Design a protein around this ligand. Sequence first.
Ligand SMILES: C#Cc1cn([C@@H]2O[C@H](CO)[C@@H](O)[C@H]2O)c2ncnc(N)c12
Ligand SMILES: C#Cc1cn([C@@H]2O[C@H](CO)[C@@H](O)[C@H]2O)c2ncnc(N)c12
Lengths: 321, 321
Amino acid sequence: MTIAVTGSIATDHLMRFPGRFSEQLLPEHLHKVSLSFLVDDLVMHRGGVAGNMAFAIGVLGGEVALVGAAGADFADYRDWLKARGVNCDHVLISETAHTARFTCTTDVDMAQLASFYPGAMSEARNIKLADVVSAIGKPELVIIGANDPEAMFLHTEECRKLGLAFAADPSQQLARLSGEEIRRLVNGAAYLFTNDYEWDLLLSKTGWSEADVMAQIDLRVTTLGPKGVDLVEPDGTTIHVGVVPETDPTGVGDAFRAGFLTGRSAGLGLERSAQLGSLVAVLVLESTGTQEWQWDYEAAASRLAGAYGEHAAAEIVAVLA
Amino acid sequence: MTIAVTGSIATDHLMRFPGRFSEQLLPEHLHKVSLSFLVDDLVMHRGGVAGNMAFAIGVLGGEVALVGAAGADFADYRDWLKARGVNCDHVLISETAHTARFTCTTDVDMAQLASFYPGAMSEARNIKLADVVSAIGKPELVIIGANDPEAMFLHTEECRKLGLAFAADPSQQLARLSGEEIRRLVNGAAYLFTNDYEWDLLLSKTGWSEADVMAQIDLRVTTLGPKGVDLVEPDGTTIHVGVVPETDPTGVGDAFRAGFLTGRSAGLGLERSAQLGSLVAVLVLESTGTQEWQWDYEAAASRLAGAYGEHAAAEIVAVLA
Ligand SMILES: C#Cc1cn([C@@H]2O[C@H](CO)[C@@H](O)[C@H]2O)c2ncnc(N)c12
Ligand SMILES: C#Cc1cn([C@@H]2O[C@H](CO)[C@@H](O)[C@H]2O)c2ncnc(N)c12
């Protein structure tokens, strides 16, 4: 039932370059760069990893508290989440620093070009998850969402000190972190999320075998883009699940992990809960921006059934009923 | 006396990556890019080419009307300019579109990485400069500042149809425009501004000799970064002027062209007015952001004199007195 989404809160300002990035990269002097793109659209959208997720879990119908640091501009955002059932009492409002900001430009192809201002996100090292357990008691899961580095350890350290289930989700910081640090985020993980490119990367940097990784966690999940995802237990069960058929980029990843874990945390099986991830990923990918999408019992039904069976569908919709 | 600054109005959101861009460019796949930088600062600053300039001319003490298109968010900006002596009556407020936005990230070295959302800037093609001449009468100079492309021609076309002095300033659109188009922005120019890199570029694209360029304009100016600028008449007079010694990036270029043309348009000589450009360029380069700098008679004096002579100084300060 109750999962607390520990991670980042941002506003996300996104643009679109209707040409192609390469065609300016190709001739440019890549040591003293002077890059400039003419964009034809600009959106501001509520974002952040821990907030795309909270909203997902909440809209899906489950219990979620948001644990992430933030600024004072954060009243519009807070009331936004609290209105759908997110419990924002545990967000840390900064005294000196604005809510983190994510700026991204995407092109026709669509390569990504981006900056990240952390703002108050760095203070998420000053939060104790105890004071949470106090307020609402000991959650079923603390998700260690991509965040401020030191927070991410502390929030992983503190789960282990309190016997709390966590779900490693280190996507963003694999690139930026060591083998040692990375492994110190993946010990006792009740879950581990990654794409396979990252999971390779992970294996190189950490120096572990796939095996002893699997000793230490209880369930690797690994999303494969247009293929699907591979959920895989230490006992080799390797349930595979394809996608609802796309036909956006940002958010999707966190959106799979939201439906999956809400579908999990309403008693559904690995597979069904994975089928539910795939539905919410694609609800995003078809929505203006990340978190201006609509949950609909009817829609989901008559669509969960196209990609998986009518057997498949009924159950997820039962449990979300 | 009265110059009307025709050009772009923007807000300018600037960040700083304390590492180096190259070090991510170097290994990346430059056809399907996935670039991301961790910035440690973020500012929002009033910007736009025609507005950095208007503010310059005005703070310097002269008459300037702002001619550029804009959105409805533009009341704070307008009152900002009108409070120092800018005449904003001729700005076109959009019905459908936000004030243009300039997003830039700069690193230690400092290569530039940037996007440009034009917003209401494209409507600057719907403005007639006649309706200006009506309101305040026929200005001494219309500056064709980097703007919406079709506007830029129209505002150059319309000057020629009305016997108005203009100052080609095409910096940004050389890259993006043809030889033909470029030349159709430089015929009868009372002034032509460029850096020398661009002026080379210009010569290639237009296919002209330095000579017949000089037939058609009345004065090429060409800024040389840490060197200076070369003002040069068709009769070869080639007065050279070094810089006040730096010891920011954006804005500077427009800031030279502001002090120069205000120093001009208070009767000063090519050289003195060029010495005054160099002062305001560097006032920017030493100011938090573009247009949070202070004009000071004392300061300028006791500083115009360090780089040029005490002869030099007194005169500019007399005329700005
Ligand atoms: C760089 C990147 C970031 C984007 N995000 C958030 O990722 C969400 C999509 O997964 C976006 O809304 C962005 O705010 C980050 N969160 C924490 N640390 C980060 N460095 C980022
Ligand atoms: C890309 C660039 C742009 C930056 N600027 C403005 O240049 C000023 C500094 O010279 C900045 O304030 C930016 O808003 C542009 N103005 C008109 N068209 C443009 N494409 C740009």
